[PDB]
């Protein structure tokens, strides 16, 4: 099939010099119509925090609060059908409850893969050869990490150029503080703020992982098993070039 070449064949960096940085859509879920799910107090801090830093990076940000599964799917498809020709990239973030292979909308759950499925180069040529970024704050299960103390012209694959960053490893809980927000988002916001313009994204995410891994530990005295637990994010990369935001 054929798409516009956005950067040259052997460039080590993606072409982040388009007229526009691109869209950033944040699906923020604080409340659910599913009985068993409690409110996610503190998610709004994450959402405001993420929105602020991304705006400074040039994204046209749109926050979608508490949508139903079909409303998310519809907007996602809408985005996939827009013309992204003058955009550097696209970024999608979701803040919600989840389980292994599952994310919750307001009314029901859906597979995380639904978030990036519509953006493969064949389905969204105007983002072909450009980085497509996904950030997900949610549990990938209910397992716990008690931690340990250290002492003393050219063709490309249509699935290329995706970066999928989960706040936690498959099978595991993801932590959120009701006043400061989720650990992953606070570390990510702080890092984007500190060096989003200069570090390539995988170097930056490495430090996000370091912050999350070192500076947070659960405080839950009422429940021994949930107490003093640790977390590391899971960065999944199909990136074929380095991504430096600059500007």
């Amino acid at each position: 099939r054929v798409a516009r070449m956005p950067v040259d064949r052997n460039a080590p960096y993606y072409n982040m010099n388009h007229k526009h940085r691109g869209m950033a859509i944040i699906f923020n879920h604080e409340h659910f119509d599913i009985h068993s799910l409690k409110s996610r107090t503190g998610t709004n801090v994450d959402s405001d925090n993420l929105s602020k830093v991304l705006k400074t990076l040039g994204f046209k940000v749109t926050v979608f609060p508490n949508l139903k599964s079909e409303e998310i799917n519809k907007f996602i498809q809408q985005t996939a059908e827009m013309d992204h020709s003058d955009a550097d990239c696209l970024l999608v973030a979701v803040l919600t409850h989840g389980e292994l292979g599952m994310l919750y909308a307001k009314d029901t759950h859906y597979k995380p893969d639904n978030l990036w499925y519509y953006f493969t180069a064949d389905k969204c040529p105007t983002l072909a050869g450009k980085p497509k970024l996904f950030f997900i704050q949610a549990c990938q299960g209910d397992r716990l990490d008690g931690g340990i103390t250290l002492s003393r012209s050219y063709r490309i694959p249509v699935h290329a150029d995706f970066l999928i960053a989960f706040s936690t490893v498959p099978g595991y809980f993801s932590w959120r503080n009701t006043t400061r927000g989720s650990w992953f988002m606070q570390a990510l916001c702080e890092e984007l703020r500190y060096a989003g313009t200069e570090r390539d994204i995988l170097t930056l995410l490495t430090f996000v992982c370091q912050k999350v891994a070192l500076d947070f530990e659960s405080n839950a005295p009422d429940s021994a098993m949930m107490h003093q637990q640790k977390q590391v994010p899971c960065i999944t990369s199909m990136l074929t070039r380095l991504l430096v935001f600059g500007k």
Binding site: K38, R40, A138, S167, F173, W175, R176, T178, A220
Partner: peptide, 4 residues
């Protein structure tokens, strides 16, 4: 602290 709460889990998601």
């Amino acid at each position: 602290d709460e889990v998601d």
